[PDB]
Structure 1
Amino acid sequence: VVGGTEAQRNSWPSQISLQYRSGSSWAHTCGGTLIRQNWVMTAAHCVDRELTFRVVVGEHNLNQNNGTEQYVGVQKIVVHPYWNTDDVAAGYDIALLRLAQSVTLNSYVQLGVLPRAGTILANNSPCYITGWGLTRTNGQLAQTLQQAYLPTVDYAICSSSSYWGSTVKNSMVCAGGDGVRSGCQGDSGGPLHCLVNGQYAVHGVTSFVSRLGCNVTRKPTVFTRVSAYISWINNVIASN
C-alpha cells in the first residue's frame, strides 16, 4: 500500500498473509481474506506459481512476534476455472484456499463478511485497501499492516479512455486513482473493505495496478468484484 497508514491490529481481523516457502524461511507474497475457519479467498494470480504456501492469520508485523499469529498450511487450491494467467484483464482473478486446519477466532482472527450477490457500489463509495505490499512503486514490503482510503470509481468512469478503458470489466471494482494512495505489489489477493449500511464488507480482491506504477493518477487499483462470485464461492465450499 502506497500512501497508507498503519492499521490498528484489531481493525481488519479477516486479513491474512499468504506466504511461500523460501529456503529456510517464509516470504509474504499476497494478501487474502479469511472467509470460513478453513477457507481463504485470494487472487488466482497469487497462486500461479508451483510453490509451497501457508497462511498466517492474526498477523500484524511480518518481521516480529505479535503474540497473536496462527500459521496454517494450504491443503487445496481452487482457482476460478476461467482464470487465464496471461490475461488478467479478462477477470476471474480469484481463488479459494482450503486450510489444513481450522483457525481459532478472536479479536485478531474473524471471518470477512461478503456483500450480497450483485451489489454494485455507487461512485465514490468509502473503502479501505489493506495489506503488506510495497509502500512505494518499486519499493519494499511494509513490515506492519497498512490501510489506505480508496474511494470507488464506478465502471462508467473506470472504463473511460483516460482511466483503464477496455481493460476494466464489470466483474471488477476500481478504487482510488488519486496519484498518492494505492495498492502495490504484495497487496494482491487481499481485501477492499467498503462501509455499507454501517458494516464493512469485503467488496474486492486486489488484482492489478498499472505497469507504469502503483500510485498513478487515473489508474485506480483494480479488484475482483466479490459480489460477482458469491455463487461460485458457495459452490466451491459446498463441493470441498
Structure 2
Amino acid sequence: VVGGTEAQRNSWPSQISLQYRSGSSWAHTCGGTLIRQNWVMTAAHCVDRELTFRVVVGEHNLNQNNGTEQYVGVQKIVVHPYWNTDDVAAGYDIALLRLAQSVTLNSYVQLGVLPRAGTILANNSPCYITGWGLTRTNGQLAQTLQQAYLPTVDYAICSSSSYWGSTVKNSMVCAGGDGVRSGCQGDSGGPLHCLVNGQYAVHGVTSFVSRLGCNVTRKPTVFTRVSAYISWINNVIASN
C-alpha cells in the first residue's frame, strides 16, 4: 500500500498473509481474507506459481513476533475455472484456499463478512485497502499492516478512456486513483473493506494496478468484485 497508515492490530482481523516457502524461510506474496475458519479468499493470480503456500492469520508485523499469529498450510486451491493468467483484464481473479487446520477466532482472527450478491457501491463510497504490499512503486514490502482510504470509482468513470477504458469490467471494483494512495505489489489477493449500513464488508479482492506504477492518477486500484462471486464461493465451499 502506497500512501497508507499503519493499521491498528485489531482493525482488520480477516486480513491474512499468503506466503510461500523460500529456502529455509517463508516470504509474503499476497493478501487474502479469512471467510471460514478453514477457507481463505484470495486472487487467482497469487497462486499461479507452483509453490508451497501457507496462510498466516493474526499477523501484524511480518518481521516480528506479534504473539497472535496462527500459521497454517494450504491444503487445496480452487481457482475460478474461467481465470486466465495471461489475461487479468478478463476478470475472474479469485481463488479459494482450504486450510489444513481450522483457525481459532479471537480479536485478531475473524471471518470477513461479504456483501450480498449483486451489490454495487455508489461512486465515491468509503473504503480501505489493507496489506503488506510495497509502500512505493518499485519499493519494498511494509513490515506492519498498512491501510489506505480509497473511495470507489464507479464503472462508468473507471471504464472511461482516461481511466482504465476496456480493461475494467463490471465484475470489478475500482478504488482510489488519486496519485498518492494505492494498492501495490504484494497487496494482491487482500481485501477492500467498504463501510455500508454501519458495517464494513469485503467488497473487493485486490487484482491489479497500472504497469506504469502503483499510485498513478486516474489508474485506481482494481479489485475483483466479491458480490459477483457469492454463488461461486458458496458452491466451492459446499463441494469441498
Q: Is TM (by shorter chain) over 0.5? A: yes
What is the count of residue pairs matched by the alignment? 240
Residue 28 of structure 1 and its aligned partner are, at CA, apart by: 0.0
Task: Output one character per residue of 1:7-34: Cα deviation in whole Å (capped at 9) or x when no partner.
Answer: 0000000000000000000000000000
| 1:58-69 map, 5 Å | 58-69=58-69
Shift in Å, 1:150: 0.0
Please give the alpha-carbon distance, in whole angstroms, between the structure 1 residues aligned to 2:31 and 2:89. 20
Question: Aligned equivalents of 2:238 and 2:30: distance in 1?
Answer: 25
Moved over 4 A (4+): none
Output the CA distance in 2 between the equivalents of 1:177 and 1:51.
32
Q: Deviations over 1:73-98 (max 9, x none)?
A: 00000000000000000000000000
Match for residue 141 of structure 1?
141
1:96 aligned to 2:99? no
* Cα shift readout 1:210-233 (whole Å, capped 9, x = no counterpart): 000000000000000000000000
| Secondary structure of 1:166 counterpart | helix
* Cα distance between partner residues in 2 of 1:101 and 1:144: 25
Deviation for aligned residue 1:167: 0.0
The alpha-carbon deviation at position 234 of structure 1 amounts to: 0.0
Whole-angstrom CA distance in 1 between matches of 2:211 and 2:219: 10
Unaligned stretches of 5+ residues in structure 2: none
TM-score by length of 2: 1.00
What's the counterpart of residue 166 of structure 1?
166
Cα distance in 1 for residues equivalent to 2:114 and 2:195: 12
Deviations 1:122-177 (A, max 9, x none): 00000000000000000000000000000000000000000000000000000000
What residue ranges of structure 1 are gaps of 5+ in the alignment? Answer: none
Give the C-alpha shift of residue 54 in structure 1: 0.0
- Per-residue deviation at 1:39? 0.0
Superimposed CA distance per residue, residues 194-223 of structure 1 (whole angstroms, 9 cap, x where no aligned partner): 000000000000000000000000000000
Post-superposition offset of 1:112: 0.0
TM-score of the superposition, structure 1-length normalised?
A: 1.00
Paired with 2:144 and 2:127, the residues of 1 have a C-alpha distance of 19
